[model samples]
Target: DDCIKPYGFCSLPILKNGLCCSGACVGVCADL
Candidate 1:
């Protein structure tokens, strides 16, 4: 839907070029 996660709470900035979300652990682009 989008690249930026509204409620992003990443443990580490793995996807440095993308946004993060709390629903995921191994954070990545929510490009769904």
Candidate 2:
């Protein structure tokens, strides 16, 4: 399935000065 969480476009492993969503709390290094 696709991203069901709010502000959730994609999922990443690492993050560098990136933003995190409250829904998944996952790091997004690039765009969705």
Candidate 3:
């Protein structure tokens, strides 16, 4: 899991389309 944003948590097999730690995620509260 290379994705690590400010106060955000990313799970394995991160989304390449820019989500989770980069975009909108269901549980994650990042840039979304």
Candidate 4:
């Protein structure tokens, strides 16, 4: 699964190993 636990709040990945690979998951671009 790509939903890995958060590391330090969007600072790192909580996966066992750097297996969870996301293409482009940037933060909030703009408002809704």
Candidate 5:
């Protein structure tokens, strides 16, 4: 698994729709 947690929490960045979302380095868009 890609989806490491239900709350989308992780030690690393979370992947979404072939893109990236904040897992810990948060509150910012890398390229939403």
Candidate 6:
């Protein structure tokens, strides 16, 4: 389960003003 989504470290350094792989997308899915 822990090794499934490794977005933890991968999502670092948030692009300053861009969308992250686990950003908005995950929130949108959760809302749905």
The candidate maximizing lDDT is 3
Give TM-scores for every candidate, taking all chains together and pairing residue i with residue i.
0.16, 0.19, 0.20, 0.15, 0.16, 0.19
Instruction: Kindly list the per-residue Cα lDDT of model 3 for residues 1-32, writing each as its tens digit.
Output: 35556456554454543344456543453664
lDDT, each prediction? 0.44, 0.42, 0.50, 0.28, 0.34, 0.29
Candidate closer to the true structure by TM-score (higher is better), 2 or 5 = 2
Where is model 5 more than 4 Å wrong at Cα? 1-3, 13-32
Q: Candidate 6 has what TM-score?
A: 0.19
In candidate 1, which residue pairs get closer than 3 Å at backbone N, Cα or C atoms, i.e. clash? Answer: 1-32
**Angstrom error at residue 5, model 3:** 8.7
Q: Put down candidate 6 lDDT per residue, 1-32, tens digits, no spaces.
A: 12212233322233332343444323221111
Q: Give the TM-score of candidate 2.
A: 0.19
Off by over 4 Å in 6: 1-16, 24-32
Clashing pairs in 6: none
Scored by lDDT, model 3 comes in at 0.50
Error of 2 at 3 (Å): 6.6
List the pairs of residues colliding in candidate 2. none
